[PDB]
Amino acid sequence: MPKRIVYNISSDFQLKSLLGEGAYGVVCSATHKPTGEIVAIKKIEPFDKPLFALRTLREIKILKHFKHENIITIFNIQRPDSFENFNEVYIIQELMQTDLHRVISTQMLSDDHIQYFIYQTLRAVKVLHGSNVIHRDLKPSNLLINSNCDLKVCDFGLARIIDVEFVATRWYRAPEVMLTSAKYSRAMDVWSCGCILAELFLRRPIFPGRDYRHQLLLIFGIIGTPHSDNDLRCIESPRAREYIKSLPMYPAAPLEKMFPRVNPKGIDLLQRMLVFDPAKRITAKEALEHPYLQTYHDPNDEPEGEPIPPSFFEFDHYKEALTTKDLKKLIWNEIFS
């Protein structure tokens, strides 16, 4: 608990431990002394640039909207004592014990744990997708975990509604997104989930590219290089098509041979997630129905969600960009509702 970490919240809270620290968010566990409850508090300074406030607002609205076992629970947002003195946002959430990046880094997981963690991840993705929401930044550190193996997705500020920026880690980015201006889609999240499932099997990232070029080499070295015009149907950009054509002609790698001790049903699911053509990639609902996850699948207990209209993030579509003060008011409205 570094002394440098300062939270301008009620003295009823006593910070306990620093859980995460980045340019956008700082997350600490803290004890709410009056009740004894230990919670997680995510602090964000949203007002130096609109970009930060936009991420904050998307995050808060998505957290408040969903009530799902695999989406981290928001308890409340602290109330500033005045609009003039509102400089940081403090999101109070249910406290989880760790995250999946730390778990994969420190624990040997059985095939049963892997089934269970990817099942829960996909169950969260299914409700987001059925609500026309894509996360766009799925990776192990954004999957929160308790010792009983409960898993909940977090970090929703890069989400978008189907129909300078913070950029999702390239290691989990779908190839069509990296290649084209392609309208981000549900399939991009399924690709990231395939990278997560592979990371669970390998105990390391499957495509740790050093840069754009290396990322594509690593991806195609495993899924095979697209070469026929049909293979390239989803790539309109002439620059992108020529670049793919300049790559070595890799065949799809025989994953069952490379990783012979992995459950073959797990490899099959993984292969269906890491497909180049987004229209042929498995959906989250189909993945929950896959044989690898039969132990946990229940078609009557996998919430589909309800569509959210683009206007839910109307602030992202203004002819004239909203000002920081404009966004401060929209965030205030979420805190007090």
Binding site: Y116, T295, D298
Partner: peptide, 12 residues
């Protein structure tokens, strides 16, 4: 609810 096998992680 469906953690049939009582899966757990020894986390400290």
């Amino acid at each position: 609810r469906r953690n049939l096998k009582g899966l757990n992680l020894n986390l400290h």
